[PDB]
Amino acid sequence: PHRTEDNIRDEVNPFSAKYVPFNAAPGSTESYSLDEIVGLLDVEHDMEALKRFDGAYWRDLFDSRVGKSTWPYGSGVWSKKEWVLPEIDDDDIVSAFEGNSNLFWAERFGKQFLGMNDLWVKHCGISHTGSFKDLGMTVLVSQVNRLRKMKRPVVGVGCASTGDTSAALSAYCASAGIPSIVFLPANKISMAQLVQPIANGAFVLSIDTDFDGCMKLIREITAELPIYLANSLNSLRLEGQKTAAIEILQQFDWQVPDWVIVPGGNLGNIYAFYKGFKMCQELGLVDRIPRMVCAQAANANPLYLHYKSGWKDFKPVSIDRAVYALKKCNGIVEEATEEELMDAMAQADSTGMFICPHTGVALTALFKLRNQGVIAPTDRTVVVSTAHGLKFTQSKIDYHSNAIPDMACRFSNPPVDVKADFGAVMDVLKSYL
Amino acid sequence: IETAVKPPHRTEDNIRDENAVNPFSAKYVPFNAAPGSTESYSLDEIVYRGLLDVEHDMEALKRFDGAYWRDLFDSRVGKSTWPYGSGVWSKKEWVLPEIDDDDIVSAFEGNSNLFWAERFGKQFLGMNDLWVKHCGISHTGSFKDLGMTVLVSQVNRLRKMKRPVVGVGCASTGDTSAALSAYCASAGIPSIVFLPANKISMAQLVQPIANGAFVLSIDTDFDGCMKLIREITAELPIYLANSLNSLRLEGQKTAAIEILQQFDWQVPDWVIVPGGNLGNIYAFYKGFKMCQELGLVDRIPRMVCAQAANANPLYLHYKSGWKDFKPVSIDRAVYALKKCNGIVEEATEEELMDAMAQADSTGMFICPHTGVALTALFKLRNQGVIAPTDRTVVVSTAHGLKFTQSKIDYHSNAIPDMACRFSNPPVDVKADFGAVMDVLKSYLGSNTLTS
């Protein structure tokens, strides 16, 4: 007769968190009940309250929740609730038990292509929406669900993008029965790109105008209707995303890896991991944080240049957080060309994986840093995969059919045509074998 | 009191640290018979006297009580050690007891997400304890990975014992082939796909291709193809994917053990298994059964085999009380369903799709088979067979991401001979505040009279 929510409702909160200006002096502070958006905001937890419990207490508390199907600890994010949204009521949490993603030992690729024996991939993309964003959306949508119930007018959530952010947002909104709206220029509508929000019941508007005319319409609409924008409560999603780092540690029985390579499409990622590794060390779960590499596609943004110039010319798509993080962990930034990224992807896939392009960027960077002697053959290294390879089948098909203009596709493995003659078949097989 | 761990060591070397007599073993046995024949797993038998089944020495296993097994397995949860980091190998003693960890080929498959379908359960079925076992949320996006790690590990073992095995072959284009080639690539074992040229589809073969499989586009049909395969394998040491079929079930059954483990060893009332491949339902039965026989739990759940309408004679036989059943091979499914007081139900193409759209509307992103499973669940709910509070688990065998075209077609009302009654296409609107505000107002249902 009872659901898991009842089961746990059967059992003062010392923990809390608040918005704070990202990296400031004694500054100000906002509440999560508010919709502040700005200087970027950062979520700050009461470290004083948390330090009242030692490292062993936190390691054990979290480990005791591993493998459970209870509410809401069955989630890799909520199993660390005290460090994410300490004050939310379990009744408001919107979760699909995201997290607890596969931590894969890349034995063959590590050894055959990098002379490594301890290379791993954190498959954040192996989840229900096929994206790392689910970790952040469970937090954002839960908070929105909380505010909604406190009768703080919130008729729905809005979004103006067509990628993974939108897919994860609409999936969680649908889960809580919260209206989800997607605002897009008609010429940007692609059934393929919108398959998830669409399947998830989102209200997708094909507006006859351009991006600018669209942003203008959104601003006007949200100005008169209680509709929060996806990338508005951006700071909140990092609280969910940072648990992936805590998870890596937990999965290694609380041993800190030497290197963690994070593909930086969204530069908030690297900061989220840093935030997660950092909270673990500050609270004594572990004694150190790993050095991190921000792997970027060539010419994606000025981050790589600044890194090469020792950060000297850096002045606070917003690389502030990434710079801060990399500085704090003696980090590094490396690039990968379109062709390196794709060839690395084909090489990884040839060893049995089925990765996303970003992971190709991460592995290219790993290759380079290996040659440069920065990363040792025996360094325990973790590459973060943020999206399921299945989302990039067209790209793989193009590469393997040598259909990518201005690229050799040197590792393509197209089907081999052969006549239905025992002799002919035996000959091609003989060569292959 | 032990030597410090070496930095050049991998988790595989790290566990080689072990030496007495292994009390556990398994062998091929004729499926469902009386006292008799047997063959080793190192052998390549396929039929007997016809299906083979893997039998474990229950005598040896029963020497350890239920609590010992529950605790041994639970102690491996959340670990990244070799090979226990795998949801399959964490139950090694019950899968391939004699294989050496050095021969195991694994990508730490298993430990898949067990999701509480709160909203769908309550809103569409009046249920409070409905769950989905996401076997499809894995590296190849398929449930087959649980079986291929076992099959490819065994093949890898036989290969190293110098028992000639130059590679593995396959004549299909679906998930089986994707999982097979991924694991083969992982062990550096040649993988070959034999297909008629007219059946080659880059989209259907993206994984074996990306995984380095040797894909042959043969100018002939299916029959000419099977003939060629029969000939090739007769002169070359190449095992066929669906040849060592029995072995795959050993891996697949761990999904059932995992469901129990995830519910803190509490047996669900119902488990609904979409039966495209009829071996699935038997694998789950095998898993639940072994847990009860060894005392981990004291009962098995009742099961439902959810089939697409007219997929095979299983549904009919079930309706005729199995009376007319005479031993693509439904023998295993029948046996299992009989053993657990099981049920068979159907779903039409449209019911399956509508159910899929309804499930997705609550936040999921399921495969068509899950639609079949939910349609069956709906029916059994109406019939009163399944109670509103029954702890029920629906098994999803493939990631919804593998069926985006299908969803796109349905939501764009482009599926011939179907209403697509729950399609949710994008809504066209003019760039006018008033216009936009009007559609949103309607959507948000902010009217008090037509609320």
Q: Could you give the CA distance from residue B153 to residue B158 in angstroms, rounded to a whole number?
A: 9
A160 alpha-carbon distance from chain centroid: 19
Residue A171 region, left (φ>0) first, then alpha (ψ -120 to 50), else beta? alpha
Residues of chain A with CATH 3.40.50.1100: 1-131+234-388, 132-233
Which residue(s) pair with B306 in the sheet? Answer: B274, B345
Q: How many other CB atoms sit within 10 Å of the CB of residue B419?
A: 12
SS3 for B7? Answer: coil
Q: Which residues of A197-232 are buried (b: 16+ CB within 10 A; e: fewer)?
A: bbbbbbbbbbbebeeeebeebbeebbeebebbbbeb
Give the CA dihedral B165, B168, B171, B174, nearest 10 degrees. Answer: 160
Topology annotation, domain B1-142+245-399: Rossmann fold (3.40.50)
Q: Could you give the CA distance from residue B142 to residue B402 in angstroms, rounded to a whole number?
A: 9
**A179 interfaces chain B, CB cutoff of 8 Å:** yes
Task: Output the CATH code of domain A132-233.
Answer: 3.40.50.1100
- Residue A23 has phi, psi (to 5 degrees) of 45, 80
The tokens of A351 are what? Answer: 């060893």
Task: Report strand pairing: A203-208 vs A119-123.
Answer: unpaired
Asked if B335 and B314 count as a contact pair (C-beta separation under 8 A), the reply is no
Q: Could you give the CA distance from residue A130 to residue A124 in angstroms, rounded to a whole number?
A: 8
Task: Report strand pairing: A291-297 vs A119-123.
Answer: unpaired
The tokens of B250 are what? Answer: 């050993």
Asked if B423 and B410 count as a contact pair (C-beta separation under 8 A), the reply is yes
Which residue(s) pair with A42 in the sheet? Answer: A20
Of A199, A204, A353, the CB nearest to B365: A199
The tokens of B117 are what? Answer: 């379908």
Topology annotation, domain B143-244: Rossmann fold (3.40.50)
Query: Among candidates A93, A82, A75, A90, which has minimal Cα distance to A58?
Result: A82
Q: Do A208 and B264 touch (CB under 8 A)?
A: no
- Residue B22 has phi, psi (to 5 degrees) of -75, 115
DSSP string, A186-217: GGG--HHHHHHHHHTT-EEEEEES-HHHHHHH
CA-based torsion, B368, B370, B374, B377: positive or negative: positive
Strand order in the sheet with B392-396: B114-116, B130-134, B392-396, B270-274, B302-308, B343-347
In the block, which residue shows the tokens 């009654």? B421
Method by which the model was determined: X-ray
Of B428, B431, B440, the CB nearest to A213: B431
Residues of chain B with CATH 3.40.50.1100: 1-142+245-399, 143-244
Asked if A72 and A81 count as a contact pair (C-beta separation under 8 A), the reply is yes
* Long-range CB contact pairs, A393-402, < 8 A, 24+: A393/B203, A393/B206, A395/A342, A395/A357, A396/A345, A396/A346, A396/A349, A396/B206, A396/B209, A396/B210, A397/B202, A397/B203, A397/B206, A397/B209, A399/A342, A399/A345, A399/A346, A400/A346, A400/B202, A400/B206, A400/B209, A400/B210, A401/B202
SS3 for A137? Answer: helix
Q: Could you give the CA distance from residue A371 to residue A365 in angstroms, rounded to a whole number?
A: 10
Contacting residues of A for B440, CB less than 8 Å apart: 181, 203, 221, 225
Letter for the amino acid at A283?
A: L
Give the CA dihedral A85, A282, A268, A126, nearest 10 degrees. Answer: -70
* Cα angle A294, A386, A47; round to 5: 70
Q: Could you give the CA distance from residue A237 to residue A137 in angstroms, rounded to a whole number?
A: 6
DSSP A415: P
Q: At what angle do helices B245-252 and B254-262 cross, to 10 degrees?
A: 0
The tokens of A230 are what? Answer: 């996806």
SS3 for B393? Answer: strand
Tell me the HSE value of B108 on the side-chain side, using a 13 A CA sphere.
Answer: 25
Q: Does the domain made of A1-131+234-388 have the CATH classification 3.40.1160.10?
A: no
Nearest CA in chain B to A190: B426
Contacting residues of A for B207, CB less than 8 Å apart: 354
* Residues in chain B that come right before a backbone break, where C and next N are over 2.5 Å apart: 18, 49, 327
Q: Do B116 and A69 touch (CB under 8 A)?
A: yes
Asked if B389 and B366 count as a contact pair (C-beta separation under 8 A), the reply is no
- Residue A301 has phi, psi (to 5 degrees) of -170, 175
* Cα angle B100, B102, B105; round to 5: 100
DSSP B425: P
Of B225, B424, B430, the CB nearest to A201: B424
Query: Among candidates A274, A266, A226, which has minimal Cα distance to A249?
Result: A274
Whether the bond between B313 and the residue before it is cis, its omega within 30 degrees of 0, is no
Give the residue ranges of DSSP H helices in B347-449.
349-361, 368-382, 404-411, 433-443
SS3 for B214? Answer: strand
Q: How many other CB atoms sit within 10 Å of the CB of residue B88?
A: 32
Tell me the HSE value of A217 on the side-chain side, using a 13 A CA sphere.
Answer: 28
- Residue A43 has phi, psi (to 5 degrees) of -90, 125
SS3 for B170? Answer: strand
Task: Report strand pairing: B167-170 vs B191-196.
Answer: parallel
SS3 for A428? Answer: helix
In the block, which residue shows the tokens 């060390």? A281
CB within 8 A of B216, min separation 6: which ones? A415, A416, A418, A425, A428, B192, B193, B194, B195
Q: Which residues of A371-405 are buried (b: 16+ CB within 10 A; e: fewer)?
A: eeeebbebbbbbbbbbbbbbbbbebbbbbbeeebe
Asked if B375 and B360 count as a contact pair (C-beta separation under 8 A), the reply is no
Q: Do B219 and A419 touch (CB under 8 A)?
A: yes
Q: How many other CB atoms sit within 10 Å of the CB of residue A73?
A: 23
Contacting residues of A for B435, CB less than 8 Å apart: none
CB within 8 A of B388, min separation 6: which ones? B125, B126, B127, B128, B381
Interface test with A, best of B6, B9, B116, B367 (most A CBs within 10 A): B116
Q: What is the largest CA-CA distance in chain A?
A: 80
For residue B55, the surrounding DSSP H or E stretch is: strand B52-56
Asked if A363 and A383 count as a contact pair (C-beta separation under 8 A), the reply is yes
**Strand ranges for B135-279 from DSSP E:** 167-170, 191-196, 214-219, 238-240, 270-274
Break chain B down into helix, strand, coil percent, rounded to 5.
40, 15, 45
For residue B396, the surrounding DSSP H or E stretch is: strand B392-396
SS3 for A185? Answer: strand
Enter the resolution in angstroms: 2.2
Query: Among candidates A382, A411, A339, which has minimal Cα distance to A116?
Result: A382
Letter for the amino acid at A113?
A: F
